[PDB]
C-alpha cells in the first residue's frame, strides 16, 4: 500500500498472507471468509505469462498477522492448503477478468481476537454500497511505492469507488462488469493505492445498516501504483458470488 498508514491491532482480522514455502516470501494478500475458506485473486496462483502456477503444497496461509516478516508467536496461525479452486472463466490471457480463487484449508483455523472472518455481500448490500464516491478500505503488506520499500506492519488506506466511465477512460485495458476501480482523482489531492504484493487482499466496506464489514472487492491490477490519473482495479466479489457459493456448497 502507498500513502497508507499502519493498521491498528486486530483492525483487519480476516487479513491473510499467502506465503511461498521456498524461497520464503510473501506472494499475496487474501481474506478469511470462514474457518476453512480463504479468498484471493486467481493471478496470485495462476499467471502463465510470468510462469506462475502454484500448487497446494507450494504455499502456506498465515492468519492473524500484523508484522510483515516476524513470526508472531502465540498470535498468528499457519494453515496448509487442501485444495485450490480458480474461477473456470478467469481470463489471464487478456485483462484478468474474473480474477478470483478460493483455497480450502486442511483444517479449520481457530478464531481469536486477531482472526475472524469477513462477510460477503448479498445483492442489496452491494447495490447500496458499491456507488461512486463511497469509500472502501484496502489492506496489505505490499510495496509502499513504485521504485521505503516494504512495510514493517500491515498497511491500510481508505479509497473512494470511482465512476465506471472514469475507470474506463483511465486505461487502454478492456474493463468488465466483474471489475470496479477505486482511488482519488488528481484534482482531489488525497492519495493512496494498492501496490505490488497487495494483490489478493480485500477491499472492504462497513455497512451502515448493520455495522458489519463486507468484502466488496479483491486487489486485482493497476498500472503502477498511486499514479495521477490511474486507479486501482478490484475484482467485483458480489458479481462472482454464485461461483463462490457453488464451490463451497459442492466442496
Amino acid at each position: 500500500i502507498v500513502e497508507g498508514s499502519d493498521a491498528e491491532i486486530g483492525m483487519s482480522p480476516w487479513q491473510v498472507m499467502l506465503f511461498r514455502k521456498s524461497p520464503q516470501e510473501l506472494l499475496c494478500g487474501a481474506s478469511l471468509i470462514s474457518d476453512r475458506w480463504v479468498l484471493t485473486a486467481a493471478h496470485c496462483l495462476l499467471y502463465p505469462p510470468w510462469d506462475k502456477n502454484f500448487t497446494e503444497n507450494d504455499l502456506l496461509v498465515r492468519i492473524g498477522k500484523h508484522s510483515r516478516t516476524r513470526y508472531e508467536r502465540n498470535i498468528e496461525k499457519i494453515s496448509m492448503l487442501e485444495k485450490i479452486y480458480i474461477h473456470p472463466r478467469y481470463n489471464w490471457r487478456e485483462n484478468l477478468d474474473r480474477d478470483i480463487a478460493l483455497m480450502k484449508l486442511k483444517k479449520p483455523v481457530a478464531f481469536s481476537d486477531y482472526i475472524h472472518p469477513v462477510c460477503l455481500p448479498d445483492r442489496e448490500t452491494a447495490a447500496s454500497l458499491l456507488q461512486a464516491g463511497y469509500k472502501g478500505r484496502v489492506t496489505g503488506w505490499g510495496n509502499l511505492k513504485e521504485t521505503k520499500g516494504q512495510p514493517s506492519v500491515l498497511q491500510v488506506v481508505n479509497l473512494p469507488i470511482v465512476e465506471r466511465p472514469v475507470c474506463k477512460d483511465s486505461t487502454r485495458i478492456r474493463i468488465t462488469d466483474n471489475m470496479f476501480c477505486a482511488g482519488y482523482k488528481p484534482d482531489e489531492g488525497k492519495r493512496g493505492d494498492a501496490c505490488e504484493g497487495d494483490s489478493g487482499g480485500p477491499f472492504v466496506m462497513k455497512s451502515p445498516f448493520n455495522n458489519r464489514w463486507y468484502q466488496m472487492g479483491i486487489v486485482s491490477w493497476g498500472e503502477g501504483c498511486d499514479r495521477d490519473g490511474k486507479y486501482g482495479f478490484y475484482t467485483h466479489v458480489f458479481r462472482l458470488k454464485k461461483w463462490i457459493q457453488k464451490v463451497i456448497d459442492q466442496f
Binding site: 514455502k21 520464503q24 516470501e25 510473501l26 502456506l60 516478516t69 516476524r70 513470526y71 508467536r73 499457519i78 496448509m80
Partner: peptide
C-alpha cells in the same frame, strides 16, 4: 533473510 523462520511443526 527478510522473513523470520516459521517454527517446524508446520514448515
Amino acid at each position: 533473510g527478510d522473513f523470520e523462520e516459521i517454527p517446524e511443526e508446520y514448515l
